[PDB]
Amino acid sequence: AMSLENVAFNVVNKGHFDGQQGEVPVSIINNTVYTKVDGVDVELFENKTTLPVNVAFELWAKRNIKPVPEVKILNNLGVDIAANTVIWDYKRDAPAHISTIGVCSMTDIAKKPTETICAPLTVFFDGRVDGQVDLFRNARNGVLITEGSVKGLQPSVGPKQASLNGVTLIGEAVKTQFNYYKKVDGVVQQLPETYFTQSRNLQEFKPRSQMEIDFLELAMDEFIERYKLEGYAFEHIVYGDFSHSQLGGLHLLIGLAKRFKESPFELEDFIPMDSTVKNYFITDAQTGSSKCVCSVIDLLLDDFVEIIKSQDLSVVSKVVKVTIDYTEISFMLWCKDGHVETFYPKLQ
Amino acid sequence: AMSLENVAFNVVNKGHFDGQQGEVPVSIINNTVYTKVDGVDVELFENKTTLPVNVAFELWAKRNIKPVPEVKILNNLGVDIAANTVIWDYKRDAPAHISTIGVCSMTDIAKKPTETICAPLTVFFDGRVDGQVDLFRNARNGVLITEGSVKGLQPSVGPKQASLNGVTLIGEAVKTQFNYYKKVDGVVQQLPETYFTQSRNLQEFKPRSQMEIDFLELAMDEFIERYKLEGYAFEHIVYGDFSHSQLGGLHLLIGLAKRFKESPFELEDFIPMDSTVKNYFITDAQTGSSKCVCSVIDLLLDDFVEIIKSQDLSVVSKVVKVTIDYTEISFMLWCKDGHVETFYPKLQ
Amino acid sequence: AMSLENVAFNVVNKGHFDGQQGEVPVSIINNTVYTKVDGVDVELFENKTTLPVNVAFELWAKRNIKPVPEVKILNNLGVDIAANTVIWDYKRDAPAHISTIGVCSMTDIAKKPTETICAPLTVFFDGRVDGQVDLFRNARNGVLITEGSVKGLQPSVGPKQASLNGVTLIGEAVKTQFNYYKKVDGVVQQLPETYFTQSRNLQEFKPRSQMEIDFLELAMDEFIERYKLEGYAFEHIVYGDFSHSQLGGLHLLIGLAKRFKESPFELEDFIPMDSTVKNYFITDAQTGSSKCVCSVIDLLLDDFVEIIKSQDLSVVSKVVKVTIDYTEISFMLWCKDGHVETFYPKLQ
Amino acid sequence: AMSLENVAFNVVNKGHFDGQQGEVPVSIINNTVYTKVDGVDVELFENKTTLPVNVAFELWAKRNIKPVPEVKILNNLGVDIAANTVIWDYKRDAPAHISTIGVCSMTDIAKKPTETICAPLTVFFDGRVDGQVDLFRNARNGVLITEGSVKGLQPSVGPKQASLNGVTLIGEAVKTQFNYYKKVDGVVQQLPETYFTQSRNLQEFKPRSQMEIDFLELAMDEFIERYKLEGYAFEHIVYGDFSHSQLGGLHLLIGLAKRFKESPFELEDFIPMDSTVKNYFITDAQTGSSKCVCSVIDLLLDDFVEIIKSQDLSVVSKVVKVTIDYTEISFMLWCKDGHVETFYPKLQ
Amino acid sequence: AMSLENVAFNVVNKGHFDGQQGEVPVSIINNTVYTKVDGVDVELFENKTTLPVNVAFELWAKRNIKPVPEVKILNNLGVDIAANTVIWDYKRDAPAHISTIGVCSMTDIAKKPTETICAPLTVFFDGRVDGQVDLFRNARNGVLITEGSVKGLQPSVGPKQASLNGVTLIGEAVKTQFNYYKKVDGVVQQLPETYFTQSRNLQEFKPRSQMEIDFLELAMDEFIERYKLEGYAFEHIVYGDFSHSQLGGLHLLIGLAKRFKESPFELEDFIPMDSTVKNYFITDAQTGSSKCVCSVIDLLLDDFVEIIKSQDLSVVSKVVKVTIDYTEISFMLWCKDGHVETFYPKLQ
């Protein structure tokens, strides 16, 4: 019972696909969907994907509208496909996954995750949906989220935040912190101890600890002496150096957040996608100090404190591997005369 | 219940829309409709209309596949819209009429021709469809075709030929000669006595009389002598004059057909549509003689001879009006010393 | 290095992709690839596929330009992908297969057929290429073609014809008849005894036997007489019945070819793709006889005669299965009084 | 006042741009120009150029509709632009020149060829247009064509053929053979003695000498015997060798013409543009013999015989330079034991 | 390597074109460039120019990322083309210049500025690049920028600001104030004494003098009294009249910037491009006062005061010419009773 006119009826009446009966007249012009509302055409969807307009429209309408893991987490866990749902990637304005299982005729590789083709793929399961926990139990490769405990399975506590309709939030009325479980080649895996990125933005930044509040308030000198971290190069790494043409350091989001409020700047997101580490072309509107590739991570300041604190401070050049969002991130631990010169995410 | 996927299912399985239940996966890219057949995309329709691709696709699938009047006839009779069908214009690769009645949700102005909006429009009715003759009786404005007599209605015998899937033909296995009836403001009109164009092509030209057979096989001199056409300027009008840079006469299709077998030429159809009189930009390959606007009509040679021989040849110039395909066609008749100089469809 | 400009250089200089170095300036406008030749733009390729224009262009340039199996054969044998080549499908003006192996960065699922992902896929291997016979021997699933005998394996003699740049031909200067080998789950299969379709066209129809020559010159009667096919309903099945509004029989290409010489007709290829049995919407220009779905097969007349003469005519209706192009084709055989009434490819 | 609606009015009424006053309603959808005729949209122009649709439409409407030099001639003479006209390239379906002079606001570089910007460009003039001969006299760089003699100027007799609305022909009702004149940096230049290509087609080939008539009628052996061409490898060069997988010779159009009538083949024009030497990807339907880049020239057989018989047969390999269509064409001459092995247009 | 895939590799890895080796898979759909990153397509560039998508992409990647003159400065100086770089026009999201020199194969008119074609063009040269000062010395027509003195050349001090990645700024860590040099027909020109527009925005308007701090904080009456501007019509010219249906005056940005803080309004930029004087369709949200064409200039208030105080107030109407951004701006000065009535940029 799948139809373009039925999908559009659901968008018009329910705000998304809700499996209701009915049809509305539709027009497809360029990469845009229109419907008629009292003699005039109303745009329902503009295709920004590489998929045909009508398939992209159906996938978008059938997106999961409950709090779901951020696609950065699903990419880091090597998630290939979702079971009987669509994870919409709001950063790319596209579905997170290429193919589907029991969602859309044009993209389905199967109707059920139990099919042969699905076995080598890491299938995403949502324990909030009836029978999905059991499907995970029968799956060869998969990743599972639950709100509560599951019989005989040790959980991994996930990030506090999840995405709800493109809004990353820590739910108060709804649950966003999930238990994570993973299977590889039929065997349940132990997920590693990890830090999580905080997924905040520049324009409306929110501190999530006293140290973060203190960072945003206290001056450079006062903060460094208060939380005691003299030789860890916070002046360069976190605060940033704008004295030269080539902008120095500034690899922590909170640092960008502090600079933004006093003096704004331009961030060019030349690779627009959700990732644990982001690369931007930054131009400071105040000094004219710029950097083409500025790698930025949003870690809780306390976590970054703990991370920098915990290192060697010996070898002139080094690589440190930290577990962030279940994946391993490399950092260039440069050193000279026994103190931190810089610390930043690895590029080449 | 209209659906793009159901329309496509009918096209794939039945060759056109046949009201069967079922769905196929469809992709819309550019102005092209594709369907998935054994994992690969197969083109079903390329939109050549000014309507949205999906709308054009549905109208094309729902086209009338029985012998129907040629578009030029419907246009000449002032038909604005069809009752519960689509007349596909194969010359324009588009629907003959802008709007529909009980066909498609995007183009319907009504579900039934009895609706108020239809009253000022000349609705085309097909007597071969149950109840359409009665709908014509109730219609304020309309045109009706039937295969047989209708109670109380005087008929007009139409052309021998009709269009079947874009093929103009004189039916032997099927009926193509219809009775025509017309109503204006509730009053049945007397259709005029008319000649009909023969709707033939240059490549597969077929004579339809002994005189036409004689025209194609005999030489210019003998034909003119045999049929006593001496002062009627057929040398110019029909045979054409290729001696000067501007091509002279050549306004009868049979004349173009005769020339074509001898030496080919180019015909630029700069207004591509069905019309009683066609205008072409002609270039003769052998001589280089050309004409920007060469008006061409396909009349049975016998009819053209009857027309020209019915004229008074006493005036230098005069406008001659002839009813053809139910419309009044104006010709320019130029005479000198009691003989014809030229005779051509008037363009000014 | 794989580059759009290098691919275009190869096309301009060599007609296709070869592996020579160089670059030409390229413009991509709409779905068209252009190159600058002496200050003006020259169209090199128009994308008619569902793939991005530049991707389709690279795949087309990298097409196999040696005689290759026709797509219908590969499809019937269950070929999913080709090893280190592109089988272009000239019926769809698109690549025959979705993905590639060592061809193009955008479509490659592997660089080598030995990779894990390839194991469940039936890979096409060309014995004329060094090491491909051995790759087939190591492959789990596959289809191999050779010009000569393969040590140990009983060959299956393929069709006499193959495709060379979209030209289906029986090679005299080149080999077009291949030996076929097939492997399923590591085990070599015995290919069935099969008939092959002749892959001819209506316009340039060439008889391939004396019977076919006689069919085309002799009259229906004289031909039925000569070959004694009185109770085999050739009048209906092969010649076709144009006496009613719906076209009777006409399921053999040679039949269509015979009628075409006499009187032309329209064939609407509503599913444009290579298939053993083709379905057309046919309209006879002379009679007006038509049929929405007319299933047409191009069998050598001698083979069709052998097929029909091999059947039992004791039952009113029965399903007849014939191996054609390595696939099982179902026919509907209708009898009455020990003679054939009709025989046609089954669809319902 | 130049306008889109006026350009279209002129096309609908005159078949091209004729400077008549008036307007018609226009729609621009995709790369297509439509006009409304009795409530329905009629396609007037489909843009196949790299210019904007409306610009291409105006240039096409304003194309020269009198016999003009073929594009290959203009290109060989180094023509960069036209004076107050548009030379339409029917081979590319685009204007022959990028920029214009007193034609179109969007493409104009000047209103008059006397403007400074035009001085280094070789601007084309037409002596058939009032004042153009004098403009050429004031021009720094230019190419002039005339029907007759010009005061105090030596003429170069051009090819017998010219292009008229995309039809290459030898005029009988019109003059196609022009006198050619050049000026480079203000000085009138003596055009070289040259051969001219005949610009004929495969499907409608016409011999233009007794030797050409003899070539088409006589068998290979007796033609070579009659014209004493024994050691000139005509069997290879002209007739072509179809015995091997790679196509042997076949570099003369007349040779292709002779083969085609006997047995057809396919010619892929992978660089679609007008040039003295054309490159095609050829596949012989009978044998399967093919060649990726088969360079073809249409020389009068008598001219080709004169060329080949004028060569010294003493060296194994040598470059032969021939002036054709005012340009120097390089050929490769291979000899053995005092007889020619092969001869062909050089590419690498 | 000059390739689409290499350009895209550079963008993904370096944030722009950096001449590094490598390739990334690219897809071109519509006017959008995508790359495959971990199995999913990521948008890198959307073409908003009139150039082909791939050309525009290369041109954008190869943009100058160092502080450069604003486009309006370059246009005012008559710059036609830039030497071995691309000046990206961020106002139009397109290259500032049509053609290039040693940048891109599709747009290059030369590889070096020393080529003949470049001689009549005013080439932009950047003294910060090795050898460009010398190239200017050899150039016929050019414009040069330097950070310091150039021996033998008298400089013109340019604006304090420059554009860095679309950000106009006064550099503190980088130099944004350049020395300007110009030459026509081989002779070095003396650039005129000029005022410069301050290139500010309404949103984040920053005063650059005490008079400007005051304009923004004091009330209209207090400000005019403090700076003794009584008969200079500042109420009309710099504050604007919102009492009538048509907006009065408001031709200074600071004025718009002062209103905006109080009450917002709409500015329709119907000619979106960089220009010394901008025209907007302004609608005041509070009053409903509007003006279709409101000419706005960003002069430092002190400069505007100096300009208006330098005028003779004896004539009713008068044209006032002021050199701004190296160009002559015409103003329309209206006086009555020895006081200013209005003063505005003249449009005709």
Numbering used by the authors:
A (entry chain F), B (entry chain A), C (entry chain D), D (entry chain E), E (entry chain C): -1 to 346
Question: How is this structure described in the published paper?
Answer:
The NSP15 endoribonuclease enzyme, known as NendoU, is highly conserved and plays a critical role in the ability of the virus to evade the immune system. NendoU is a three-domain 34 kDa protein that was demonstrated to form a barrel-shaped hexamer in solution by the assembly of two trimers. In terms of substrate specificity, NendoU of the coronaviruses is described to cleave a great variety of single- and double-stranded RNAs in an Mn2+-dependent reaction, by hydrolyzing the 3′ end of pyrimidines, with a strong preference for uracil, and to release 2′,3′-cyclic phosphate and 5′-hydroxyl ends as products.
However, the most drastic similar effect was obtained when we added the DNA oligo(dT)30 to the samples in Bis-Tris at pH 6.0 and in PBS at pH 6.0, where we saw the immediate formation of 2D crystals of NendoU in the frozen grid, which somehow had induced the same pattern of arrangement of particle in all directions. Due to that, we tried to use this condition to obtain a crystal structure of NendoU. Furthermore, polar surface structural analysis showed that this pattern allows the perfect battery-like piling of the negatively charged S cavity of one hexamer into the positively charged switch region of the adjacent hexamer, indicating that the biological function of these two regions is related to the formation of large order supramolecular agglomerates.
